[PDB]
Amino acid sequence: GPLGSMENVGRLITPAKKLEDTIRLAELVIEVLQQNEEHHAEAFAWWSDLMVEHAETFLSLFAVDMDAALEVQPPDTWDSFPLFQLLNDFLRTDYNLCNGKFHKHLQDLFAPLVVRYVDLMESSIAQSIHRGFERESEDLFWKLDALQTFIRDLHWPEEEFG
Amino acid sequence: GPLGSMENVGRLITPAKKLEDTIRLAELVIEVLQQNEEHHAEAFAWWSDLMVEHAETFLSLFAVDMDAALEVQPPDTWDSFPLFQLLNDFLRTDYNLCNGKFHKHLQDLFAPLVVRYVDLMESSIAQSIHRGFERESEDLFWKLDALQTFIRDLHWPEEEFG
Ligand SMILES: [K+]
């Protein structure tokens, strides 16, 4: 009868209830455990979205100090390249800020200033190799090495063909 | 003199100070911005490490209810497979808990129970195809489809050859 179709090893436990019950409990453990992962993911995002917004904003307020220091610059003078190096070397290996609003502004603000320096040193090596056309190399090689060393240390974030 | 080697557009700003200053400021913005990323990463970890520990622990306390429901089981009866399906389908697509302590226990607790069912249905199809040896197929095909449907829905986390 019902009581005997229920008795196992001296205890009244329908083995299809001790399973149907274990199921519903597993259902609840899973749901709590997932809800916990959702909470963690969602808080990560909130704090992230806000800290990136904060970073992009404080970089704007800094930009004005940078844009301003790059007009006090005598034209075709490039002791401002260490600034681009420091700033771009941080932003490019930064998941959050790479190609962000400030990064693109730092590229634009320096994109003419970089080409106006390579065109100026490529014209001073081209003239010096063309100096063998009028009648009457060690120092010249250094300027090739200088331009190559410079270009490699630029780690430019685009693909600049020309 | 010093005052004139300083005057630009009516303001006494050494253009190599308005750069050296912009540099040190960029140094500080970068450091704060990175410190902020470090904080976020580190808190993510703390909360993560603790929520995984919490999950693995509450799965232990559940295991005893599961280990217990799998001895109240009449040998070679498999309405306990929907439990493995629910639990394993969650754990396997869960970055944190996959192949964790509980996941491996759920594999072990069901690894004999799965092979003891395929060997039992592979022996009941092999006998029925071997029934064409004594003198004197539609229903038999269903059991192949049943075993294939079962095996695919198992999504076992190892590579079980045999
Ligand atoms: K977090």
DSSP characters for A130-160? GGGSS---HHHHHHHHHHHHHHHTT--SS--
Residue B157 CA neighbour count, 13 Å, CB half: 23
SS3 A99: coil
Q: Which residues of B133-148 are buried (b: 16+ CB within 10 A; e: fewer)?
A: eeeeeeeeeeeeeebe
Nearest residue on chain B to A91, judged by CA atoms? Answer: B30
CB atoms within 10 A of CB B120: 11
- Calpha distance A75→A116 (Å, rounded): 10
- Calpha distance A125→A139 (Å, rounded): 10
Query: B14 to chain A, minimum CA–CA distance in Å?
Result: 9
The burial of A92, by beta-carbon neighbours within 10 Å (0-12 exposed, 13-18 middle, 19 or more buried), is given as: middle
| Residue B54, amino acid | H
Can you list the pairs that A19-27 forms with residues at least 24 positions away whose Cβ atoms lie under 8 Å? A19/B69, A19/B72, A19/B73, A19/B79, A19/B80, A19/B83, A21/B69, A22/B65, A22/B66, A22/B68, A22/B69, A22/B83, A23/B82, A23/B83, A23/B86, A25/B62, A25/B65, A26/B62, A26/B66, A26/B83, A26/B86, A26/B87, A27/B86
CB atoms within 10 A of CB B115: 12
Nearest Cα to Cα of residue A62 among B82, B24, B128: B24
Q: State the distance between the two ends of chain B, measured CA to CA, in whole angstroms.
A: 91
- Calpha distance A136→A154 (Å, rounded): 38
Calculate the alpha carbon distances from B13 to A64, B26, B124, B127 in Å: 16, 19, 94, 98
Output the furthest CA–CA distance in chain B (Å, rounded). 122
- β-pair partners for B7: B12
CB atoms within 10 A of CB A159: 5
Nearest Cα to Cα of residue A30 among B107, B64, B90, B51: B90
Residue B10 CA neighbour count, 13 Å, CB half: 0
Q: Measured in angstroms, how far is the CA atom of residue A51 from the centroid of ligand 1? A: 12
Q: Which residues of A touch B97 (CB under 8 A)?
A: 33
Pick the residue of A72, A84, A95 with the most B CBs within 10 A to test the interface with B by mutation: A72
Nearest Cα to Cα of residue A90 among B32, B20, B16, B21: B32
B11 membership: H or E segment, kind and range? strand B11-12
Nearest Cα to Cα of residue A16 among B99, B139, B73: B73
- Calpha distance A64→A87 (Å, rounded): 14
Q: Which residues of A touch B40 (CB under 8 A)?
A: 44, 47-48, 51
- Calpha distance B129→B142 (Å, rounded): 13
3-class secondary structure for B56-124?
Answer: HHHHHHHHHHHHHHCCCCCCCCCCCHHHHHHHHHHHHCCCCCCCCHHHHHHHHHHHHHHHHHHHHHHHH
Q: φ, ψ for residue B12 (rounded to 5)?
A: -90, 85
CB B83 within 8 A of CB A23: yes
- Calpha distance B117→B125 (Å, rounded): 12
Q: Which residues of A touch B90 (CB under 8 A)?
A: 30, 33-34
| Residue A145, amino acid | D
Q: Measured in angstroms, how far is the CA atom of residue B47 from the centroid of ligand 1? A: 7
Q: Measured in angstroms, how far is the CA atom of residue A77 from the centroid of ligand 1? A: 45
- Calpha distance B23→A87 (Å, rounded): 9
Q: Measured in angstroms, how far is the CA atom of residue B80 from the centroid of ligand 1? A: 37
A117 membership: H or E segment, kind and range? helix A101-129
Query: A43 to chain B, minimum CA–CA distance in Å?
Result: 9
A-B CB pairs within 8 A amount to 115
**Which residues fall within 8 angstroms of residue B106, CB to CB, at 6 or more apart?**
B66, B84, B87, B88, B91
User: Residue B5 has which token pair?
Assistant: 């080697």
Q: By what technique were these coordinates determined?
A: X-ray
Output DSSP code: residue B130. G
SS3 A41: helix
User: Residue B38 has which token pair?
Assistant: 């470090």
